[PDB]
């Protein structure tokens, strides 16, 4: 339940774009990660890294961010 609330905040704290929430959880919110969360805001990019982009791609199911249609390609 605590992790579900954290992820629901990450879905809320940014937008109806769950993929960025997943990336923020995996890569940390605010450490190394925070540049990536901002970097995402410019297209899927390469500023994001080995585990970041691959894990973000793994959740190309539900839903429903613009970058989810934009990650591939």
């Amino acid at each position: 339940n605590a992790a579900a609330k954290q992820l629901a905040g990450l879905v809320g704290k940014f937008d109806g774009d769950e993929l960025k929430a997943a990336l923020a959880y995996n890569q940390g919110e605010g450490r190394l990660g925070n540049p990536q969360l901002e970097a995402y805001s410019k297209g899927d990019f390469a500023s994001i890294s080995e585990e970041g982009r691959n894990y973000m791609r793994n959740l190309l199911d539900v839903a429903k961010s613009p970058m989810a249609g934009q990650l591939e390609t």
Partner: protein, 62 residues
């Protein structure tokens, strides 16, 4: 100095922009290629100036 800097960074902007028009995923937001050594900084002024000058340029084409 501004005239040379503007011309150089302007052609750099236009080339990196033609890249976006033809290709994809080029990130023309603000942060471009300033490593020309001569172009130096990009002010925000160029992209507005770039759009305006290029639009008039298109208007003047044959």
């Amino acid at each position: 100095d501004d005239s040379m800097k503007s011309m150089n960074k302007l052609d750099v902007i236009d080339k990196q922009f033609q890249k976006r028009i033809n290709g994809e995923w080029v990130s023309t937001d603000f942060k471009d290629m300033p490593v020309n050594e001569n172009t130096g900084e990009f002010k925000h002024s160029d992209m507005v100036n770039y759009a305006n000058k290029k639009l008039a340029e298109i208007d003047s084409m044959d």
